Amino acid sequence: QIDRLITGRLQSLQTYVTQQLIRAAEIRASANLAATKMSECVLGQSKRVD
Amino acid sequence: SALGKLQDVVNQNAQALNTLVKQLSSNFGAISSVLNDILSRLDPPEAEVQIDRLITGRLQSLQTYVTQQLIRAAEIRASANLAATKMSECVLGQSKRVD
Amino acid sequence: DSTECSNLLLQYGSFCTQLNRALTGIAVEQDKNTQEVFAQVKQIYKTPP
Amino acid sequence: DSTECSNLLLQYGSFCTQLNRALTGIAVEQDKNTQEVFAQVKQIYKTPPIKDFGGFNFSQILPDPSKPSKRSPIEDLLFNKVTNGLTVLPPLLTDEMIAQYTSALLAGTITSGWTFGAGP
Amino acid sequence: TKCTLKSFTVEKGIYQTSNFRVQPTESIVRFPNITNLCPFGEVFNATRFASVYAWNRKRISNCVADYSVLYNSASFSTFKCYGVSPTKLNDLCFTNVYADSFVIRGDEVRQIAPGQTGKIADYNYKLPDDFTGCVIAWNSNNLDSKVGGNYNYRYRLFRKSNLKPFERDISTEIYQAGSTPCNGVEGFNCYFPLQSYGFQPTNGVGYQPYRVVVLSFELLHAPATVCGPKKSTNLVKNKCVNFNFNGLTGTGVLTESNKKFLPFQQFGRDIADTTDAVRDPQTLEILDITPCSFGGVSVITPGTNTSNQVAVLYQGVNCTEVNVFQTRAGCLIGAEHVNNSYECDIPIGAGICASYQSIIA
Amino acid sequence: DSFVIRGDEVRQIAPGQTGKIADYNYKLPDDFTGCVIAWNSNNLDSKVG
Amino acid sequence: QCVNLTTRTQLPPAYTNSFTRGVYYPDKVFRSSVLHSTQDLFLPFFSNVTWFHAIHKRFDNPVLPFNDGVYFASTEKSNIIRGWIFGTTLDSKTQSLLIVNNATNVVIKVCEFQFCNDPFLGVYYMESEFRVYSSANNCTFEYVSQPFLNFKNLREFVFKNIDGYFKIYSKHTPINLVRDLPQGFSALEPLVDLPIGINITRFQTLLALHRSGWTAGAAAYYVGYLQPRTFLLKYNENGTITDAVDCALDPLSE
Ligand SMILES: *[C@@H]1O[C@H](CO)[C@@H](O[C@@H]2O[C@H](CO)[C@@H](O)[C@H](O)[C@H]2NC(C)=O)[C@H](O)[C@H]1NC(C)=O
Ligand SMILES: *[C@@H]1O[C@H](CO)[C@@H](O[C@@H]2O[C@H](CO)[C@@H](O)[C@H](O)[C@H]2NC(C)=O)[C@H](O)[C@H]1NC(C)=O
Ligand SMILES: *[C@@H]1O[C@H](CO)[C@@H](O)[C@H](O)[C@H]1NC(C)=O
Ligand SMILES: *[C@@H]1O[C@H](CO)[C@@H](O)[C@H](O)[C@H]1NC(C)=O
Ligand SMILES: *[C@@H]1O[C@H](CO)[C@@H](O)[C@H](O)[C@H]1NC(C)=O
Ligand SMILES: *[C@@H]1O[C@H](CO)[C@@H](O)[C@H](O)[C@H]1NC(C)=O
Ligand SMILES: *[C@@H]1O[C@H](CO)[C@@H](O)[C@H](O)[C@H]1NC(C)=O
Ligand SMILES: *[C@@H]1O[C@H](CO)[C@@H](O)[C@H](O)[C@H]1NC(C)=O
Ligand SMILES: *[C@@H]1O[C@H](CO)[C@@H](O)[C@H](O)[C@H]1NC(C)=O
After folding, report:
1. Which atom number of ligand 6 is nearest to the Cα of residue G107?
2. Do E69 and E229 meet the contact criterion of CB atoms below 8 Å apart?
3. Reduced to 3 states, what is the DSSP secondary structure of residue D19?
4. Contact yes or no for G156/G21 (Cβ under 8 A)
5. Closest to A29 (Cβ–Cβ): which among B29, B71, B78?
6. Residue among C2, C22, C29 minimizing CB distance to A28
7. Measured between alpha carbons, how far is E171 from E123 in angstroms, rounded to an integer?
8. Rg (Cα) of chain B, in Å, rounded?
9. Beta-carbon neighbour count of residue B23 at 10 Å?
10. Residue F9, Cα to own-chain centre: how many angstroms?
11. Which of E67, E177, E327, G187 lies at a 20 to 30 A Cα distance from G150?
């Protein structure tokens, strides 16, 4: 019974860590975009449209 | 620590391979982690259960390894796309983009 | 706090180490993201009075 | 090599095919990344034998003829400073060919500026 | 390739199709040298044997017991084993061996067995029903019989109750068969329980002296140390064989090693805790265990519209373990190597590409 | 499949059993489907001699 | 034959630092240029190790517990220490282990010895005195082997009893330190594995008298107790353990 609880909770934790990694990748991409906007829009004038 | 990014990628890949190889030593709740020991020590009705436990544990480990490999592949692909953009805009031309 | 559960959990190997390492990587990644976005100047400028 | 284990493994279906396909996709993706980054010129440019660039010295970045690897001193330093069914596939582009691509890019950007990136 | 891709038409390129493994050819079973034999000379070849009432019990421990020497001897008349077979005695291992030695008559050999009834079983030597071991008996009319009569062997003739298993009774107290007290003197209804055997060389085979050695094998929770001789197959090198060294088994190619082991160390492990070095137990030499050459099998082909010719790439496998061309990526079979350089059409790896013009690499 | 066995041997007519008639008289596979039927026949399949 | 020793001088036993001693090879596996983490019965670094003396009049033969395992260190010259006694009750009721090293060979016997209160060996100024046990009735294991053995010699032994196996680990070190344990690292090689299979909870040190009453030769020994813990061992290119880290000693080593 403890083995069943362990495998269920471990599967839940692996699912949580995997989705957190995917969201971390998305947030990292957004942060890289934000750093690019900080460098190019605030610290200089950008000729890139929109 | 100048070349930390490449060494970080090499260390992560080597550590993932080492973890995947190391996971074979775990029995995952079976009596032993060695398939030969189970096949030579038990009858097939219970050896089937022990082998099934080893198979599900190793399959979970391999799927986990493939999942982080895919996530790292996405990160490296993003870095490579950025590197290609820098090669096109900084080396093959002069860039007006700040920083 | 169950010792029997931890003893059974040790049979599965280093899954917990992998999960902790992944979460630690995410946690340092957030600080790295904030450092890249906001810490782009090494001089703290002030406006005139 | 256990036959019984493989027979029991067949009950779970095409998991192995999925994992192999994902790894194959990653492996081809790495080669695609290397092609995208380094193989951006279709002409292998070379520097003139006389290094008269108006006082500019490029010895540390141009390939060294003395070295068998045909790498630059900076590239040589960079290469020196980086140290059960598993197989490692070799990269499609070897280190000397990648160095050759960098040498071609350096020769193009030194002798021609940005013109080679936009045409002849 | 058509079966793998589930299509009758295959486009131009390289496709991973199979896995190539080298099959094991021989089995190498090397265990330690068969030294330090158990002292069986002092039990079987003893100059004198004990009486059945005072049977000798010699305990055998920490050595190698070779049972094939005893089994293949022609000098033994009875070699009846109870609870175990003689064939697997030379393989199995036991914690201790009890060697009980005595002399009985020819007709009394049958009584040395579980569940038997007689003077010897009840009053002299009793075996348990759940007995594991062997009863070995042989005729000794040449040694234990003299012309005058050999009376150097006594047995217990009367006791009030039967003996317990593995019990020795050496008491010389007068047996009381009657209500009257014996008072220590052998008179009427009171007999001395130990009686001598009459052994003459002219007696019949049912009355001739027989030396009996009973080996008792027991397993206790302690680690078993009396093991049989472990037969060693000759060592074969440079081939993918199944090795079993001192109970450590696996499959690999055994080659010579330059690693200098310390004298107490036997096996070798890498960073990933896999056995890659070993010491041969028979001859103290170091052998490297290289895993057998396994690799992917990829099929390089152009489109089926163009041609049906194919080439095969064995990834990470040298050409000598399988139009042969050796690449860093692996062995390529079916494509001719040219010295001219062209653009990459089908990627092979390590700077090598393939094309169709026959298939060239 | 009809036969006559002992009273204690009815447990051995089953998948995955270790036994004597299981090995040398009648063996069932591990993936056996069906039903085993056993009933006492002392009134019919026995004699006083 | 047993003899009471009534000329002892009363003194409390001393204590000292273990430093980085007591590390033994955990297994029979060759490892080269690697760092291996092992969880086993080890002696903690810089622990409090009990110190006993033999000097003239000190003769330290107390009754000590065995627990999970015992580390025995010996700063020895002129060969006074001769063996050890292992058991539970140290009499004929239970079965006990005898290890002795006389002038010729090393003898290990597992018998129900009726031990003396003060078991000892003797040197006359040749060995002609042996008073350890009065009887030996039931013997199960016998093993005769080669001789194992300012203070000039350092003897390290580790005694463990797991799964009916008595593991004895040994290391011999030439030293020139006068009174205490030298500070350094030396990995203990495995000496012997014995399938004795007996219960052991108590042990005794066997010494040798010098006769010319009796005189005790100059010797000192140290007793430490093993605890289950993790060590990180460093294997060099030649497969010899050259350094170790106690995983639970301090946060730096952790
Ligand atoms: C360009 O730079 C290189 C390297 O900085 C110069 O080579 C050096 O030349 C001096 C004197 O000839 C030597 O003492 C150094 O040891 C050389 N350095 C190396 C790394 O070899 C080179 O002279 C410079 N000028 C030209 C025209 O090439
Ligand atoms: C040496 O001294 C010990 C301890 O004083 C003696 O052991 C005692 O012997 C007496 C015999 O009269 C027993 O009644 C005690 O119970 C024993 N003590 C213990 C703790 O068991 C030992 O006998 C002495 N040796 C000799 C040879 O007399
Ligand atoms: C005992 O004697 C017989 C008869 O010569 C001989 O064949 C045998 O090898 C000897 N040893 C044993 C152990 O039986
Ligand atoms: C083992 O025995 C053989 C002869 O049978 C001998 O040549 C070899 O040296 C022995 N090896 C050891 C380690 O004693
Ligand atoms: C060792 O223990 C004794 C008493 O058990 C104590 O007095 C002494 O201070 C301890 N030494 C150390 C270094 O802990
Ligand atoms: C050492 O002990 C063994 C075994 O008891 C004995 O055979 C040997 O003679 C002894 N040697 C001396 C010098 O007492
Ligand atoms: C131990 O010895 C006593 C007398 O010496 C004996 O009665 C007893 O049976 C023996 N026990 C074993 C297990 O040998
Ligand atoms: C060993 O002896 C101790 C003390 O006599 C006892 O408490 C323990 O249960 C014994 N263990 C075994 C396995 O006999
Ligand atoms: C290892 O052994 C070699 C000789 O085989 C020796 O030259 C070297 O110094 C040794 N290394 C160490 C650390 O002892």
Report:
1. 4
2. no
3. helix
4. yes
5. B78
6. C29
7. 12
8. 22
9. 22
10. 6
11. G187
Ligand nearest to the CA of G49: 5
Closest residue by Cα to atom 11, ligand 3, is: E41
Rounded to an integer, what distance in angstroms lies between the CA atom of residue G121 and that of residue E29? 47
Q: In the 3-class helix/strand/coil scheme, how is E205-265 assigned residue by residue?
A: CCCCCEEEEEEEEECCCCCCCEECCCCCCCCCCCCEEEEEECCEEEEEEEEECCCCCCCCC
Nearest CA in chain B to E251: B36
Q: From ligand 6's centre to the CA of E74, what distance in Å?
A: 40
Annotated resolution, angstroms: 3.1
Experimentally determined by: cryo-EM
Long-range interactions of C16-23: CB distance < 8 A, separation 24+? C18/B19, C18/B64, C18/B68, C19/A13, C19/A14, C19/A17, C22/A17, C22/A20, C22/A21, C22/B68, C23/A17, C23/A20
User: Contacts for F36-41 with beta carbons within 8 Å, 24 or more apart?
Assistant: F36/F10, F38/F10, F38/F13, F40/F7, F41/F4
**Domain residue extents for chain G:** 14-254
Q: CA dihedral defined by E323, E326, E327, E331, rounded to 10 degrees?
A: 80
Class of residue G252 by CB neighbours under 10 A (exposed 0-12, middle 13-18, buried 19+): exposed
Window 17-36 of A: residues touching C by CB (8 A cutoff) are 17, 20-21, 24, 27-28, 31-32, 34-35
The Cα E312–Cα E319 span in angstroms is: 12
* Gyration radius (Cα) of chain C, Å: 21
Q: What backbone torsions phi and psi does residue G58 show, to the nearest 5 degrees?
A: -115, 130
Q: Return phi, psi of residue D109, to 5°.
A: -75, -20
CA angle F34–F39–F40, rounded 5-degree value: 160
Q: Which residues line ligand 7 at a C-beta cut-off of 6 Å?
A: G 137-138
Nearest CA to ligand 5 atom 8: G15
Closest-CA residue, ligand 3 atom 10, reads: E45
CB E224 within 8 A of CB E218: no
Determine the residue among B11, B17, B18, B28 to mutate to test chain C binding: the one whose Cβ has the most chain C Cβ atoms within 10 Å. Answer: B28
Using the mean position of ligand 6's atoms as its centre, give its distance from the Cα of residue G154 in Å: 25
G153 lines ligand 6 (CB under 6 A): no
Task: State the Cα–Cα distance between residues G21 and G5, nearest whole angstrom.
Answer: 33
The superfamily (CATH) of domain G14-254 is Spike glycoprotein, N-terminal domain (2.60.120.960)
Query: For residue G4, which atom of ligand 2 is closest to its CA?
Result: 1
* Distance between E163 CA and the closest CA of chain B, angstroms: 40
> What does the DSSP assignment read for F1-49?
------SGGGGSSSTT--SHHHHHT----TT--S-------TTTS----
Pairwise CA distance, residues F28 & F15, whole Å: 5
Residue G32 and residue G165 in contact, taking contact as beta carbons nearer than 8 Å: no
